[PDB]
Structure 1
Amino acid sequence: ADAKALDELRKPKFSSKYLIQHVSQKLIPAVK
């Protein structure tokens, strides 16, 4: 799927950051 539950995914809900701060340390060499 519906829309009104899917507009709520525009908000940050992660409640942990052991991936979002990890991937930027390894995305840019992998795409370069």
Structure 2
Amino acid sequence: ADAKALDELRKPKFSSKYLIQHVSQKLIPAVKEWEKSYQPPVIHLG
């Protein structure tokens, strides 16, 4: 493990790719259930 492969060494370290993947995995099914549960409310004028 003292020598590493080039495909392991090519990747940049501190990118926000897994933050974006985490936000996407928390955002997409929630907005899917919002889309399937969408009902516009009845607004009273007055």
TM-score normalised to structure 1 length: 0.30
Question: Which moves more between the two structures, 22-31 or 7-16?
Answer: 7-16
Q: CA deviation at 1:9?
A: 27
Q: Percent identity?
A: 100
TM-score normalised to structure 2 length: 0.25
Judging by fraction of residues, say which structure has more helix: 2
Which of structures 1 and 2 has the bigger CA Rg? 2
- RMSD over aligned CA atoms reads 6.7
Q: Please list every run of 5 or more consecutive structure 1 residues that lacks an aligned counterpart in the other structure.
A: none
Q: CA deviation at 1:2?
A: 47
Count matched residues. Answer: 31
4+ residue runs over 3 A deviation: 1-14
Judging by fraction of residues, say which structure has more strand: 2
